[PDB]
Amino acid sequence: VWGHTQLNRLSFLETVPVVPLRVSDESSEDRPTWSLPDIENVAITHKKPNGLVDTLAYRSVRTCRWLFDTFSLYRFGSITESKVISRCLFLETVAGVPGMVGGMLRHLSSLRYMTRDKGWINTLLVEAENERMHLMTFIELRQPGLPLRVSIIITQAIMYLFLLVAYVISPRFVHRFVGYLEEEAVITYTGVMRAIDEGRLRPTKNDVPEVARVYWNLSKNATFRDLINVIRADEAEHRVVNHTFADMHEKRLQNSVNPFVVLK
Amino acid sequence: VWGHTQLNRLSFLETVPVVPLRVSDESSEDRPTWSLPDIENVAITHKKPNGLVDTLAYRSVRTCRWLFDTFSLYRFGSITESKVISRCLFLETVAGVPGMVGGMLRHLSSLRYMTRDKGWINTLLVEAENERMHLMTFIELRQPGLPLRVSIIITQAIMYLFLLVAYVISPRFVHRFVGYLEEEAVITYTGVMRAIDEGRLRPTKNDVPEVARVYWNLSKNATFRDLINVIRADEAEHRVVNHTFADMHEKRLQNSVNPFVVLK
């Protein structure tokens, strides 16, 4: 019931106290739809860099991972649920920046040039949302201290600034950078799953949060392992989508149809 | 068919030449759904300013309209389809900025503070999209010259800069400003409809563009008058949504549930 009578009211501020906080409202209705036994065989891939921009994007991603794993100490001592959840918590904050700056920029460009966007913007905005829901999930499993909360704030200031100027200069670099980020994300999350299957990691967070159970349409029997599986699948999708988008830029197809709008 | 095999491919760049340019792909699948005879009675309203911020927002909107109508010469000589389409073309470029900066900012905040957004972001992003589709529609009816294209570019540079810093400082001001913008938009578009009904404006663009016919689920018998009706309805929705959001800020409910997620 949304008609002229509601459109003619000044404010619905009076209604806020009587509307429930439902977990399904945290996202849009564009939810991933994975089948566990299929996404089980998501694999680790690597796209060869074409030239200088692609090499720059990859060297910057690899430099970032080597810094990050060494400073965060992921490498030494055994894997644990605590360092896994902690790691992902941090990185998922950054993860939702690229698609939002990308979509914002293609949006602005569509408006100032009065051009069609042909399905790109929505794909990058939903990507951004997807990563944000990754974050919403992990913060149900672990609430960070002040040091990590302060680091997250300053890391956002830097990555937003970087991603914004980089996308204005070279959308190709950004899409490729993201592509390469998701290559590493798929590696990390398959390391998580492998350590679970090998008993090196005995996860205890096996009451998958409600936010995630409705977002990924997971049953109440889904476990931590299943949740990481669907997150990893999401990452692989971003991996392909972004390398594809970078390729299109490389070929001067940035004003062509988003091929994923149909492949749907 | 979207599974592990596709998630494991490096790029779908090879598929781009075989995917069709469909007008339904220009937006997301979150389309307005208006009934013409109901939205016919959308009306002109005015929200009373609360205090200094609200007065500032309204005085700035009214100052902008008085400047704009006088410089653009909307006022003198008769109304025509040419000046109507022209006007809307220009203003719809600005129109899609606010919701995108708003949604981008609530998104970033959700990520750095690891908080829930509770349905706000999606509402502002779809708003931004909606306005952009207003623009996509009007540019099917009229293609602008260079002077107006240069003015659109520089107007975006200024309004984006304004809206970005204003939203960081006072989301309340921005939401209220938008609320007041849409008050004027609803006035303008009801002036258009009234001039049509009174024969002062005999519109010739009565083959509603395909982009708009699928976006608003309009029949092939829909006319220019019907298209303005649905655009006006969209504006009225933004009018309420934004005044509501401003009110929530005014009451420190900015971290409460988006009431419109349910009112749906």
Ligand SMILES: CC(C)=CCC/C(C)=C\Cc1c(O)c(Cl)c(C)c(C=O)c1O
């Ligand atoms: C951007 C930055 C400061 C660090 C990224 C760390 C990196 C280059 C690779 C590992 C990695 C990860 O290990 C995980 Cl868990 C995720 C979710 C992502 C997401 O992009 C990811 O990139």
Ligand SMILES: CC(C)=CCC/C(C)=C\Cc1c(O)c(Cl)c(C)c(C=O)c1O
């Ligand atoms: C923001 C700016 C430079 C001008 C806005 C003009 C104004 C204050 C009022 C009239 C008006 C309009 O006349 C029309 Cl047609 C639209 C679509 C809008 C949308 O916001 C609108 O505000």
Ligand SMILES: [Fe+3]
């Ligand atoms: Fe992620």
Ligand SMILES: [Fe+3]
């Ligand atoms: Fe990711």
Ligand SMILES: [Fe+3]
């Ligand atoms: Fe509009």
Ligand SMILES: [Fe+3]
């Ligand atoms: Fe508007």
Ligand SMILES: [O-]
């Ligand atoms: O990620």
Ligand SMILES: [O-]
């Ligand atoms: O508008």
